């Protein structure tokens, strides 16, 4: 009844406060109001409250992130459970272990939030009945359960996506009501008074397709605020949409002369700063209107070049960063720094097309540009892991058949560690290839010097000459070989001075 809702709402419950607001609103000239001024004000303050911490970053009072994911008979997992971190989660493993499956499930879950933010009662994406159910499952259905956190007033938002296999008489339903309720809160509060909206984005392998400026009549209006949710979880961020939006911003800025200052110029400057700060090679971006087709130009290593002359790796990362910055800017109009808005971003193979030099700073740049975004990322690289804390890593055992219950962190601290150590321990990969016969030569040497008595002979000298010819003088392998030679020549002069006196 009314009084239970009032007791919960005054205690901090967001759902009860929104229920009270909607009810009291219903009576337009009756009990309640328009901003119920108690209930609508509490809901909007819940969504909008925050403070700037000591580092100058705005922090929302009630953060939004994904707490837990359960996968039941989904692809290769019989029953898997994940405990994603609030700020960054990195999933690693061999090929075909299910990282892309996890990101796909999370994106399918977030599509319901996006759809119900866009429309009342909108329908999000659903699990496939042809490929998502485990092939050898007995039940012939799959579940994807999730729990979301939106502050102390809304600690759990459970949503379950289910699908029965093709040609099964008994069908399984999806429990998507709480996500609809949270998105209804967001949308209704936004209608009455503009509020900052969360950003949900998925960047699959489906990105990195060629980019030509073929998008003129693209139907949709890129300035319209809710265009930031269009194809946002498809896998390939709409970089053509970003180009149109950027050209629109440039036109509005150059055609112009509450404080007589254009907010389009501020948005353009924020996006420019984000793009220049995150992408290493790109230094400045602008729009050229002479040569009278619109063109976007960037400064690559001091050379002004066009947007379609970028390499695969400076264009894919630029597309990701530009799309994310555009969506964050459009969805956070009330923030001083729109990139400090909240949301969930999924990046599959963050090291894609990137040199090892760029892998050393991609995570740090992404987290500095977007500090309140919950990043859930997969990677195949020890270099990216060396820049990431141990608690953020979820590893797959090298001998998993899908029947593992809970994914875990490695036992070795990866942040600040050498790449060889992370490769050997975390990634379970030999630092030196085992299939190359030249890799066992140092060990095969040692034995020869020990098979004898620490002393060089014909075959050991042949092997040492082979190591000299292959690796070279300055190579470390010859340094260790000659160190072993010198040492064993030394522990034998010692042995000599000892057995002589020991008789």
């Amino acid at each position: 009844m009314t009084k239970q809702y009032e007791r919960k709402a005054k205690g901090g419950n967001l759902l009860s406060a929104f229920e009270l607001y909607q009810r009291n609103s219903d009576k337009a000239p009756g009990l309640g109001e328009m901003l119920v001024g108690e209930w609508f004000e509490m809901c909007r303050d819940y969504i909008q409250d925050g403070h700037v911490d000591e580092s100058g970053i705005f922090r929302p009072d009630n953060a939004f992130y994904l707490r837990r994911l359960t996968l039941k008979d989904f692809r290769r997992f019989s029953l898997l459970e994940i405990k994603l971190e609030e700020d960054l989660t990195v999933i690693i493993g061999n090929n075909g272990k299910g990282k892309t499956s996890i990101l796909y499930a999370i994106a399918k879950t977030l599509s319901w939030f996006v759809a119900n933010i866009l429309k009342e009662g909108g329908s999000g994406q659903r699990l496939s009945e042809m490929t998502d159910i485990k092939n050898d499952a007995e039940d012939r259905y799959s579940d994807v359960s999730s729990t979301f956190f939106f502050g102390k007033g809304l600690k759990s938002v459970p949503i379950r996506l289910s699908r029965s296999a093709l040609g099964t008489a008994e069908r399984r339903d999806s429990e998507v009501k709480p996500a609809k309720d949270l998105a209804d809160i967001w949308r209704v509060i936004n209608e009455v008074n503009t509020i900052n909206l969360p950003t949900f984005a998925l960047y699959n392998v489906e990105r990195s397709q060629p980019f030509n400026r073929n998008i003129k009549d693209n139907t949709g209006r890129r300035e319209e605020r809710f265009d930031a949710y269009s194809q946002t979880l498809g896998g390939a961020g709409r970089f053509d949409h970003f180009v149109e939006w950027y050209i629109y911003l440039h036109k509005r800025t150059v055609s112009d002369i509450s404080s007589r200052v254009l907010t389009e110029s501020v948005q353009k400057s924020i996006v420019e700063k984000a793009i220049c700060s995150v992408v290493p090679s790109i230094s400045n971006i602008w729009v050229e209107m002479i040569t009278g087709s619109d063109l976007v130009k960037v400064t690559n290593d001091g050379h002004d070049v066009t947007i379609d002359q970028l390499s695969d790796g400076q264009r894919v990362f630029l597309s990701l960063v530009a799309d994310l910055a555009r969506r964050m800017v459009m969805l956070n109009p009330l923030l001083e720094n729109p990139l400090e808005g909240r949301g969930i971003v999924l990046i599959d193979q963050i090291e894609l097309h990137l040199h090892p030099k760029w892998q050393q700073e991609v995570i740090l740049n992404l987290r500095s540009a977007f500090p309140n975004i919950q990043f859930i990322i997969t990677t195949h690289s020890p270099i990216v892991l060396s820049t990431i804390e141990k608690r953020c890593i979820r590893e797959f055992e090298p001998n998993d058949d899908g029947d593992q219950s809970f994914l875990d962190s490695p036992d070795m601290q990866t942040k600040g560690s050498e790449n060889a150590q992370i490769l050997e321990q975390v990634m379970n990969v030999h630092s030196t290839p085992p299939g190359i016969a030249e890799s066992h030569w140092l060990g095969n040497f040692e034995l020869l010097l020990l098979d004898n008595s620490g002393e060089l002979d014909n075959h050991s000298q042949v092997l040492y000459d082979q190591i000299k010819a292959h690796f070279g003088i300055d190579s470390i392998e010859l340094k260790k070989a000659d160190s072993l030679i010198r040492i064993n020549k030394m522990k034998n002069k010692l042995n000599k001075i000892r057995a002589e006196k020991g008789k």
């Binding site: 090298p398 060990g443 040692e446 034995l447 020990l450 160190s483 010198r486 030394m490 522990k491």
Partner: protein, 211 residues
């Protein structure tokens, strides 16, 4: 491996009788103090510091139930099945991974000497000792294969970078034989040897320093 010396059998082991009483009944907190003095908090098969550890039966209870409550068949091994199965090394690998092995083909660190059956190269790989022929070589190879001393990259890499971490120390100490007299260099060698007792891999480092 390292030689292991025994002590008095714990007084709770004989209170239980094999066959009638199952192993999951016993209290491990009491059998452990006696498996820690002998091992110094290090694995009996790979000499890794025991952060995740469990009681290991050298002869499996499934094949040989008779040796279930016998202080001589008890051991301290790394890994833990109770803390999830992420261990392809040592006792867990012997019971689950390797398979098709004979217990008489594995060296027992309790009684048999591991120094004369195994050699730890400075490259991080353990090979059967030089001159081993017949049953000794077969036992060494079987032990290396079954306990996965060479195998899972975690153990091999950690042991390798542990041995090569002190290679400058070995070079620097041994390059000053002629500079120092016999007694001072001898005492320096002992000082170096007795401070690797607390180090993780007991015998890899020992093989790298000594003679």
């Amino acid at each position: 491996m390292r030689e292991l010396a025994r002590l008095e059998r714990p007084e709770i082991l004989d209170q239980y009788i094999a066959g009638q009483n199952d192993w999951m009944e016993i209290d491990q907190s009491a059998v452990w103090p006696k498996l820690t003095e002998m091992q110094g908090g290090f694995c009996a098969y790979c000499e890794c510091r025991l952060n995740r550890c469990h009681i290991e039966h050298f002869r499996p209870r499934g094949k040989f139930p008779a040796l279930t409550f016998i202080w001589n068949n008890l051991f301290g091994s790394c890994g833990d099945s109770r803390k999830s199965g992420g261990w392809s090394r040592c006792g867990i690998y012997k019971d689950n991974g390797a398979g098709a092995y004979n217990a008489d083909d594995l060296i027992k660190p309790d009684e048999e000497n591991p120094d004369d059956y195994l050699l730890f190269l400075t490259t991080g790989e353990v090979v059967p000792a030089i001159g081993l022929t017949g049953r000794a070589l077969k036992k060494a190879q079987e032990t290396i294969r079954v306990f996965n001393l060479n195998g899972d990259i975690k153990l091999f890499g950690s042991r390798r970078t542990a041995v090569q971490a002190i290679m400058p120390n070995v070079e620097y100490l041994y390059t000053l034989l002629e500079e120092f007299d016999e007694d001072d260099w001898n005492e320096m060698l002992r000082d170096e040897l007795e401070k690797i007792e607390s180090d993780e891999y007991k015998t890899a480092l020992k093989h790298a320093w000594t003679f």
